[PDB]
Amino acid sequence: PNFSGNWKIIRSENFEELLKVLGVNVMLRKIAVAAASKYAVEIKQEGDTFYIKVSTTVYTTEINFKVGEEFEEQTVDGRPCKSLVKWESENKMVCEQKLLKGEGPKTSWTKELTNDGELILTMTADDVVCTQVFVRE
Numbered sequence: 050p051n052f053s054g055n056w057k058i059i060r061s062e063n064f065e066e067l068l069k070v071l072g073v074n075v076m077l078r079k080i081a082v083a084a085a086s087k088y089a090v091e092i093k094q095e096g097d098t099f100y101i102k103v104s105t106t107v108y109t110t111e112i113n114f115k116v117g118e119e120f121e122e123q124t125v126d127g128r129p130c131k132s133l134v135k136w137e138s139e140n141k142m143v144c145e146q147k148l149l150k151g152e153g154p155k156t157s158w159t160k161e162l163t164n165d166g167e168l169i170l171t172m173t174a175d176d177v178v179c180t181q182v183f184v185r186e
């Protein structure tokens with residue numbers, strides 16, 4: 050597959066519920082949900098190496114990794130973690146995360162390229178799964 054692209058969000062479900070599990074208070078959850086309404090994901094993929102830039106209106110972050118090699122990023126609620134991405138199939142990868150310090154919910158994410166040109170991101174905290182769908186810009 051080629052995940053490369055400038056991806057624009059078209060749907061976001063269960064994001065507030067995810068943030069609630071992660072301990073974010075109500076007003077900030079609503080504000081974060083609003084920022085997700087228009088956010089972008091830019092992917093450059095070369096073989097098993099990924100460069101990912103996630104951007105909202107006022108914030109941008111980069112996530113760089115090679116599949117199967119541990120790296121450091123942050124959880125959704127911003128806690129530093131160690132991460133490891135593996136393929137689950139031709140067009141889907143899964144990332145397991147472990148907190149660098151302390152305890153907290155078990156978090157992870159997945160990225161899938163569908164056959165109709167959508168990118169599906171999921172983000173999980175314990176029992177709660179957020180699903181977001183993007184198309185290429």
Ligand SMILES: *C/C=C(C)/C=C/C=C(C)/C=C/C1=C(C)CCCC1(C)C
Pocket residue numbers: 081084085088090101103104105112124125126158160170
């Ligand atoms: C592989 C693609 C990944 C890991 C995308 C991750 C995206 C996020 C962690 C998005 C986080 C956001 C917040 C934590 C609040 C502001 C809105 C978002 C959706 C940009």
